Design a protein around this nucleic acid. Structure first.
Lengths: 103, 156, 125, 63, 230, 29, 213
RNA sequence: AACGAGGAAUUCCUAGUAAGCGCAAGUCAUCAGCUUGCGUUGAUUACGUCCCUGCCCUUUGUACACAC
């Protein structure tokens, strides 16, 4: 499970989203947007959580092959999310669409 | 010392220093009742409900707002709670509540109808006298001794 | 001497003595400035008559408040009353009274406790 | 789900009602004509507009 | 295709209680139970319709009302169900005198009738029975009413005779994805089914035929396992 | 039992349903 | 094309007032962070009972607000939320604690959902008001529930009471404190997402009233 | 061994109130196992209704008009 809280404050754990039971390697925030978290896991799925609803994933971004361990956003389009697995096959995903298969 | 009208001008009331408040007709030119106090205190002002049911008057000496019924000449109660003389009184033409101007520097709103019996003070800068109220019945105009004229809202 | 005017404020057992003189635009309470009020959440309740009136009307006046008695909430309410009374008593005496009237109206349109303090008197039914 | 905002025309009195139920004539906001007697539970004064769930029941005495 | 969970050991499901009002769960209430105590003099006994009846005759109550045996075998049937092993229900007891008892889902009920009567006669006077491992007290007497202690998203129905017969499967699947089903059964002998019609809103029946108190909760709970897919 | 206002309502409902009963019957003949 | 110049001398004070205070003299802000402007009650029938027309600095104006009957409608609901946080025996008569909790609460709400924390509170209070409610009938033992409609003041009063208890019951014995769960309860109440306690009582009290009209 | 905020059943309470906090005094009765004052903090919810339970009043309007 991932935990996101305020900077310069260890005392106030603001949010603790429970992801899948696999370990989460990378948890990145959106660059242009400022309210949606994107996390990966060893469960071979990336998830996009809006922090208003920290219990159900807004878009379960699937289709990965093995061990997504680094993902990034693209500063032009907010609908496009880059996703890197651990076997090559650098996925480029769309979240405006259904979001279960790369473009 | 104070003269007021009530109920389409057919009946009319008057307060004097004699210790009485006297109703009058303008059809038969005669008094109906001569309401009095328990010891005949003086009187400053008079006010009437827009319905011809309750008369009230205020005094220099006893400074309790005595109220009478129009039908029964006995006084109902003494609406008290002031320090120094109640100067002016007036009933609201819609909400049917009375406002008391007193030398306590406080404007008192008395809701005396229908199980309420509640007292609301609005305290002002200085010795407030000569109250008046809108025909809408939601505002109170008062004249302080300091010179300024203040305008309030009865409900708020 | 310089022009001066003095007002009083009152919460439950806390009194405030504010003296308003012409000067350099400085604000003082108990020797300390106004940026050091200790309840730390009610510090915007003592800036409150400052920012309703516009800070230009305090740019040439001086305020010195002593406070004794009360606790913390009752003390801060005494300071905001004595500053608001002290500003409106300076402007009725040596400045325009139409300035006083717009100063008084800006307070009573906001809240009546800044001008005169309602004594929370007991009532028997 | 058609909610209907309803201005209170007059809070009634001297009617058979339980404590915490005041019988109130309300009037819809779609037109100024049609008034329906309903029951209001909370502290209600004059001229506050009120949200009705449905708009056809004829609210009788609470007995 | 889909990735497995990282942990595959079997783990104990959480013990649902009145503190938690979130998860989807089953509530069974043995309402109008006949469980009261009286002093023999030197000893304290539970009133029975069979053991001592002339005591009830002096009390003015009828003999046939005080039946704690049917409430005993209702608990043994309900708590030994596989749903209790699956940890998806808790059970309350609403007595005839207004005492409301919360039965925790982990308690090992005494098996014979005489040991259960000994357990309850100290429950009504100490207000709680503690655990042998000193963790958390099993049978806790809680505050009236029952509707505040139910889960928040709540569905209340009762088991009756004149009620329409619907399949137990069809009522559970037509219930929502997070509502907690609360069924208020009659733990008394024979009489009116108006023990908790104030709380529930529709009466629900299971058969046109006469069903006992033990088999009424047993039928619907066995429909709960076949609908919640354990 | 009842209250004034409610007593007139049941009087109003009973008589006019009888009045509208004889009115439609008069239109029948 | 048209100017009204009222300030001529640059306003410099001998006592140094910080610029965070000086820029607050144009718009009166809640806690000097959030503006009361454009905070409009979206759902109807709770205006003049949920009031945000007058702006307030801190939620602490202890006036005469219970002596009259409907004087409670004039309270700003930021202050009505702080005053209603004393729903226990341990936090009675501690408003400086209750104001500091709400200041932390509006901080978390603005960080999470970025429009306005006050606008969320206005939207959250106007959602969870139970628009239909039930009451019993005496009837000589015939105690049947009967649906009755609800005053707008009671809709405000039940909304604030349920949202505060929803914060207090969630952080009863947990790792989260009252400031975190009140932000979670208010944000879920503004969406109407049916996971807050307050929305879960809104449809439950209505459906009980909807079961017997 | 008893004990994780207390059952049924009851009692009190409408604004500087309930509740929380300390300080002082020990007043010809009473009080040290406590009593009485004085300050700090300071709310929710009615503020309507006679539907239930009670309690009382009235049933010639006589106190001068008009109205009823």
């Amino acid at each position: 499970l991932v935990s996101v809280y305020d900077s310069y404050n260890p005392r106030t754990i603001l949010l603790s989203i429970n992801a899948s039971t696999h370990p989460t390697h990378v948890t990145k925030f959106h660059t242009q947007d400022n309210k949606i978290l994107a996390t990966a896991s060893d469960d071979r799925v990336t998830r996009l959580w809006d922090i208003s609803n920290a219990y159900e994933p807004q878009l379960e971004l699937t289709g990965a092959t093995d061990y997504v361990r680094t993902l990034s956003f693209i500063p032009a389009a907010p609908h496009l999310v880059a996703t890197g697995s651990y076997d090559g096959l650098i996925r480029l995903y769309d979240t405006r669409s259904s979001g279960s298969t790369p473009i | 010392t104070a003269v007021q009208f009530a109920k389409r001008g057919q009946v009319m009331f008057s307060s004097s220093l004699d210790g009485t408040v006297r109703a009058w007709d303008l059809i038969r030119y005669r008094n109906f009742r001569t309401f009095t106090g328990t010891e005949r205190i003086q009187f400053n002002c008079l006010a009437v409900d827009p319905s011809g049911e309750v008369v009230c008057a205020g005094s220099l000496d006893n400074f309790d707002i005595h109220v009478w019924s129009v039908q029964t000449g006995q006084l109902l109660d003494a609406l008290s709670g002031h320090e120094g003389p109640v100067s002016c009184l007036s009933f609201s033409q819609e909400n049917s509540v009375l406002a008391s101007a007193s030398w306590d520097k406080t404007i008192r709103i008395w809701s005396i109808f229908g199980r309420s019996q509640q007292v609301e003070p609005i305290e002002v800068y200085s010795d407030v006298l000569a109250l008046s109220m809108r025909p809408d019945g939601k505002e109170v105009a008062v004249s302080t001794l300091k010179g300024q004229i203040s305008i309030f809202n009865i409900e708020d | 001497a310089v022009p001066s005017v003095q007002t009083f404020g009152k919460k439950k057992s806390a009194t405030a003595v504010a003296h308003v003189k012409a000067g350099k635009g400085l604000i003082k309470v108990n020797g300390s400035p106004i940026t050091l009020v200790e309840p730390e959440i009610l510090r915007f309740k003592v800036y409150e008559p400052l920012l309703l009136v516009g800070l230009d009307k305090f740019s040439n006046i001086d305020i010195r408040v002593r406070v004794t008695g009360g606790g913390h909430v009752s003390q801060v309410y005494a300071i905001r009353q004595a500053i608001a009374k002290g500003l409106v008593a300076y402007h009725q005496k040596y400045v325009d009274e139409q300035s006083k009237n717009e100063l008084k109206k800006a307070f009573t349109s906001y809240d009546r406790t800044l001008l005169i303090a309602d004594s929370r008197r007991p009532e028997p039914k | 789900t058609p909610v209907t905002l309803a201005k209170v025309i007059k809070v009634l009195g001297r009617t058979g009602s339980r404590g915490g139920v005041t019988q109130v004539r309300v009037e819809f906001l779609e037109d100024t004509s049609r008034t329906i007697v309903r029951n209001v539970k909370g502290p209600v004064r004059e001229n506050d507009i009120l949200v009705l769930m449905e708009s056809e029941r004829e609210a009788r005495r609470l007995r | 295709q889909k990735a497995l969970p990282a942990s595959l050991v079997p783990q104990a499901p959480p013990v649902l209680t009145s503190k938690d009002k979130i998860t989807k769960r089953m509530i069974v209430v043995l309402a109008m139970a006949s469980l009261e105590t009286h002093k023999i003099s030197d000893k304290y006994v539970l009133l029975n319709c069979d053991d001592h009846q002339g005591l009830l005759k002096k009390m003015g109550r009828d003999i046939s009302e005080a039946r704690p045996d049917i409430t005993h075998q209702c608990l043994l049937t309900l708590l030994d169900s596989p749903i209790n092993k699956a940890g998806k229900l808790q059970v309350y007891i609403q007595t005839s005198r207004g005492i409301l008892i919360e039965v925790n889902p982990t308690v090992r009920i005494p098996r014979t009738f005489k040991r259960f009567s000994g357990l309850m006669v100290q429950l009504l006077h100490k207000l709680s029975i503690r655990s042998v491992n000193s963790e958390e007290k099993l049978l806790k007497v809680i505050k009236n009413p029952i509707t505040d202690h139910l889960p928040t998203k709540c569905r209340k129905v009762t088991l009756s005779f004149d009620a329409p017969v619907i399949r137990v499967q069809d009522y559970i699947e037509k219930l929502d994805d997070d509502e907690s089903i609360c069924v208020f059964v009659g733990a008394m002998a024979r009489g009116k089914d108006n023990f908790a019609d104030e709380y529930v809103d529709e009466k629900v029946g299971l058969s046109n035929y006469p069903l006992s108190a033990s088999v009424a909760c047993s039928k619907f709970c066995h429909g709960a396992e076949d609908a919640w897919n354990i | 039992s009842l209250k004034a206002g409610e007593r007139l309502m049941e009087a109003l409902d009973l008589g006019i349903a009888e009045i509208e009963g004889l009115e439609a019957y008069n239109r029948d003949m | 094309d048209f100017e009204v110049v009222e300030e001529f001398t640059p306003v410099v004070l001998a006592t140094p007032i910080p610029e965070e205070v000086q820029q607050a003299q144009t718009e009166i802000k809640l806690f000097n962070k959030w503006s009361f402007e454009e905070v409009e009650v979206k759902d109807a029938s709770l205006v003049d009972y949920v009031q945000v027309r007058q702006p307030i600095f801190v939620a602490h104006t202890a006036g005469r607000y219970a002596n009259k009957r409907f004087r409670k409608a004039q309270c700003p609901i930021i202050e009505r939320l702080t005053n209603s946080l004393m729903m226990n025996g341990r936090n009675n008569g501690k408003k400086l604690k209750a104001v500091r909790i709400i200041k932390h609460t509006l901080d978390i709400i603005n960080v999470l959902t970025d429009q306005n924390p006050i606008q969320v509170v206005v939207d959250a209070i106007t959602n969870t008001g139970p628009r239909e409610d039930t009451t019993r009938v005496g009837g000589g033992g015939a105690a049947r529930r009967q649906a009755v409609d609800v005053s707008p003041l009671r809709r405000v009063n039940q909304a604030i009471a349920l949202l505060t208890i929803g914060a207090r019951e969630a952080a009863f014995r947990n790792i989260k404190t009252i400031a975190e769960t009140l932000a979670e309860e208010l944000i879920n109440a503004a969406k109407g997402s049916s996971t807050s306690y307050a929305i879960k009582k809104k449809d439950e009290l209505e459906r009980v009233a909807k079961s017997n009209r």
